[PDB]
Design a protein around this ligand. Sequence first.
Ligand SMILES: Nc1ncnc2c1ncn2[C@@H]1O[C@H](COP(=O)(O)OP(=O)(O)OP(=O)(O)O)[C@@H](O)[C@H]1O
Ligand SMILES: Nc1nc2c(ncn2[C@@H]2O[C@H](COP(=O)(O)OP(=O)(O)O)[C@@H](O)[C@H]2O)c(=O)[nH]1
Ligand SMILES: [Mg+2]
Lengths: 349, 101, 192, 202, 80
Amino acid sequence: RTNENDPAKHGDQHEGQHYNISPQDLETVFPHGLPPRFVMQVKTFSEACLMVRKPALELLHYLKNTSFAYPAIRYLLYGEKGTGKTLSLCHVIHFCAKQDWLILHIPDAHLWVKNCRDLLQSSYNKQRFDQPLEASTWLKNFKTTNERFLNQIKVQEKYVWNKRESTEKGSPLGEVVEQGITRVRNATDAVGIVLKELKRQSSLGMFHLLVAVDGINALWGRTTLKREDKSPIAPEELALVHNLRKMMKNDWHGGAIVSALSQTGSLFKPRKAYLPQELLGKEGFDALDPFIPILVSNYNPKEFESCIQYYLENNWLQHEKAPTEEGKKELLFLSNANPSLLERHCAYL
Amino acid sequence: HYVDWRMWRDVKRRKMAYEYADERLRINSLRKNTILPKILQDVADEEIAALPRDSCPVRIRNRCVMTSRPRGVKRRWRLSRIVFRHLADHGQLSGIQRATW
Amino acid sequence: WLIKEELEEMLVEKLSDLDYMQFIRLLEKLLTSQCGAAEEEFVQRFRRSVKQLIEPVQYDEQGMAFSKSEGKRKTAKAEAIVYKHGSGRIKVNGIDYQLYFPITQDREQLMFPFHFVDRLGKHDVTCTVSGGGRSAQAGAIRLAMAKALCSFVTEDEVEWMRQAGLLTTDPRVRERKKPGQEGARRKFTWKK
Amino acid sequence: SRYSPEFKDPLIDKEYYRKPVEELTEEEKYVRELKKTQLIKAAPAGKTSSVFEDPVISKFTNMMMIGGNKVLARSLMIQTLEAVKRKQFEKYHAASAEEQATIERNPYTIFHQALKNCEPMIGLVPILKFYQVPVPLPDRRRRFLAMKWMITECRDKKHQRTLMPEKLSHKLLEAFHNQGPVIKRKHDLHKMAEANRALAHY
Amino acid sequence: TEADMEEYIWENSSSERNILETLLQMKAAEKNMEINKEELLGTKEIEEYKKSVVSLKNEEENENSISQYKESVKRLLNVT
RNA sequence: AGUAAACUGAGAGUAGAGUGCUUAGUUGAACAGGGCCCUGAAGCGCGUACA
Ligand SMILES: Nc1ncnc2c1ncn2[C@@H]1O[C@H](COP(=O)(O)OP(=O)(O)OP(=O)(O)O)[C@@H](O)[C@H]1O
Ligand SMILES: Nc1nc2c(ncn2[C@@H]2O[C@H](COP(=O)(O)OP(=O)(O)O)[C@@H](O)[C@H]2O)c(=O)[nH]1
Ligand SMILES: [Mg+2]
């Protein structure tokens, strides 16, 4: 536990201690993305406490040393399953949001590339496919996270939604987002327009952009979605995926592209694929490189004690032997300091 | 002096099939392909049909050599199950013991 | 006492059950009659009498001590090397135990011996397993680890493990299907 | 059984082995000495020496098992425990100080108390003289009947699309509070026993 | 084609092109136009980077290889 | 009791042909305590009766 709640002052001195996110900030900045199990824990406890760690502090120092004049640099948080990459990305997202950044956050790319009942054909490009439901979902999440910047940011082009309906240069980005949401048919197109406008305006310096993409390995992998002829679909055929790759490019400046690999839900990948190349594949490695790889691993004994004491204080560990050092040692044995295994045991312990 | 007229018929079928095998082989190769004219394959079909019915290998049955039983014949010994059991239980078959594991 | 067949062979004679009972009762009376050495020697001619092997502690090139053992379950075989000192690491087929055994039941099987002797985190283990299903592999690794740990735990601890069942090879193996019945005991649906 | 009759079931209890010699009686000393000579079966994979071992819950899991999916059975059991704890936590948080004392929050305590509430004192067997007759139930039968009744009630199709964990948690809380169709079933059994009282002399 | 070689070759490779591009971007931002392809590739840092990348691409991938690669990338990107 | 149950392979035979048969393996439990009207097996025996 730390008294410091501002995400710009805390550093290594706070290592091994929880950092609280207020409910209002959780709602605004993080209406999505956060792991389902941590969401259940937050619902149970009324406390969104993430222990600060070297990975998150490192990437915060990276973003403080970043020069927006530089073309946006890529960072890649990689590791095994349940090492907390998602929560580190969320922590840094909170930092940038409190720093007034525009957070272009992708909660998970695995969802975008599977189980898409609504798969129409993009009007803007008849050779691609749209995912109106997911487009609307992410548009709503982005609006929730950056409503303030939504109005402040204007468009710089004419965008035709129908033969008679269009949006005009200089209009606020709110008009585009509203069109995408209400007119779900235009959802993917609005997502692409938003990505383009945010990229160009970050280049112009209207704000500072953090492109925080979770499970980035999905983009350059494979897809299970099948055409009306049952043919397989490659990722580029998904306008969302192609636009997200365009964003993953570093050609633009005015921000940084942070990403976090995630095997959870990955397609055709064996359970043990956790290395950057093994996940991204040749195409993904080639697209991301250059990148700064940051490892996320199990807990150390200090952070293990911090997590256990957090659960004990919250009384989550309602069993009698949980405070006992023997129970602590058994938890360490079973979870090998793995955050996800530890929590998935503590849930019924 | 075969066991029965059915075994003798089978022997005749075997001899006829062996004699006419190559002609049957080539005619069947001609018939089963998608290159030659359909008229060519039709003339081949009538030729194969005109070839003696008994020459067809399908009409060859694996009757027991020693009793001409039409069913339950082990292909490795060509003997009916009854005769195989008799010999095995009399120990006349090398290396074949009884069943216990 | 020696069984009736043993006595029959000893006497190269054919006895009866009542004959054996008479002889055994007379012998029992001879016991109870303060049989001295000169008599106990004769009696022991009719008596019949009714521990896990401690493997050597070998050493590596670096001089670190360890003990190697093996064990088989169903169709699985496991060779386990347990080091005198270790931080509880248990590498299976070059893989971490939790990764290799994605089932908490198998993890508990692995933990059972070391938990029983309260030596968790005091030994580093390398287990190479082969053959059989997941549960068979878990059982084989557990047996091998228990045997290897015997060398490092005291004799009383070894006896306690053996009593518990850690050190006893499992004789339960699949029973072969029998002809004319679906399973080893499943008789085909009784027609009528 | 491949185990010969000589084999004895292993005893898994640390305290039984740590008990001092002096406290042992002569009979207990003899038993301990004897066990050193007997053959012990290999331990079943189910039970161990964990301090969090509950034979009642293991039995309920085995009963709830279908076709050998012990993994799913255990998942369902733990999920029900968590759900019951969550509901109790919500009630405790929504309850005043005085009611917080009376509010329980231990899933195992609620589980066992509910099963005890669902145990049937008496059960009716066919007696011949056939007549359905009120007859006392052994404790094993009472516990088994309670478990089976709970599982059957949770498996009733009346619950539409509801998941086994939620269903079982709700039924467990109802029984814990001495309500629900399982308690109604126990009461129906007792009423039938009362009505057939006259036929008990058979 | 590159899909017809068992051995990855850093020369004329995506990684080589990308690292050269990154160096050019950094030096352009620094504004010192004292840079060239040969000048950038002649430094021992790029040698270490290419060595590590070749190791990762061809040899077995392990923690030691990943750590060496991370060290090289950090020294190249002037981040520590 | 590695039994039931579930699942997956392989073999016999044919040119081909089974949801049939044979066989290998995997996960893998619950009851085991009451009684004899019903079936059958006995002893205690009873009473029938013809060869
Ligand atoms: N810094 C932290 N603060 C609090 N809890 C944490 C932290 N890091 C990890 N945890 C706990 O670890 C659990 C497991 O993390 P989770 O699996 O969601 O992360 P991930 O790295 O995205 O992994 P996965 O590959 O499983 O998606 C989280 O639910 C959370 O409870
Ligand atoms: N409906 C609509 N969509 C647009 C318009 N302009 C841009 N977009 C969307 O914005 C995304 C980015 O556009 P852009 O990169 O310039 O098109 P591309 O380079 O040819 O793929 C596209 O995928 C479109 O879906 C427009 O005028 N109308
Ligand atoms: Mg994460």
